[PDB]
Ligand binder design. Structure first.
Ligand SMILES: C[C@]12CCc3c(ccc4cc(O)ccc34)[C@@H]1CCC2=O
Ligand SMILES: C[C@]12CCc3c(ccc4cc(O)ccc34)[C@@H]1CCC2=O
Lengths: 125, 125
């Protein structure tokens, strides 16, 4: 089935995969017809190909991501607070969002939504 | 309109109202036909009366609640990590969930969902 332990584990695999730039590891977490909403408001990408392409572009730069709090998992859902750090042109940026995963009975992620705004983007000059 | 600043402010008012046991202050944040999903999975209470009753029972005990991280506000949505502490029969409990608010154009909350599980309930013996 799908348990809080399993959802928490998936969140951790997700986080470790972004760190390793393990694209197959990330997509394998999703259902074939899942949706990924990179930033709320935007049009949710659908399907394995779309999902993989999104993460592929998100990995152009080396990312350092970690959970900053315990994962919240309950009845087919999980939400977590974390940070995604990267550096560009001598500038270090740290995006602090909160993600939400919706699982199916198979334990696969059918829906992922990343929530963050300008105030959650911490960068120097 | 509805802005990240306004949504963040509503989250802070929400948190301060629970602390003050200000029931009118909390309900006033919601749209008349809003829904509150106390714990994911359960049936979402609907309408002012239902919403107020839920918070009324949640305030039977004195609650100490605070944000533990920055609020995430983007396009009609906000999510936040926080703690709700209370004491009973000499036992101190701290529930650490992540909430999600959906706003309308008026800046009112039309949907609130609290996400947390047993692993997010920290209590001693
Ligand atoms: C796209 C991005 C890399 C990945 C990423 C960002 C923000 C939120 C995320 C949420 C995720 O669940 C997975 C990856 C990201 C960054 C915004 C700036 C940047 O370089
Ligand atoms: C009901 C409760 C008081 C309020 C409350 C809890 C958990 C999550 C919440 C999320 C909210 O957005 C507002 C109030 C609560 C506690 C669980 C144990 C308890 O006494």
């Amino acid at each position: 089935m799908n348990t809080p332990e399993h959802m928490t584990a998936v969140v951790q695999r997700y986080v470790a995969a972004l760190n390793a730039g393990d694209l197959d590891g990330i997509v394998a977490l999703f259902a074939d017809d899942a949706t990924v909403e990179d930033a709320v408001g935007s049009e949710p990408r659908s399907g394995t190909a779309a999902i993989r392409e999104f993460y592929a572009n998100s990995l152009k730069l080396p990312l350092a991501v970690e959970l900053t709090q315990e994962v919240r998992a309950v009845a087919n859902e999980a939400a977590f607070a974390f940070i995604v750090s990267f550096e560009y042109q001598g500038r270090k940026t740290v995006v602090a969002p909160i993600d939400h995963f919706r699982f199916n009975g198979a334990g696969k992620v059918v829906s992922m939504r990343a929530l963050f705004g300008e105030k959650n983007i911490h960068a120097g000059a």
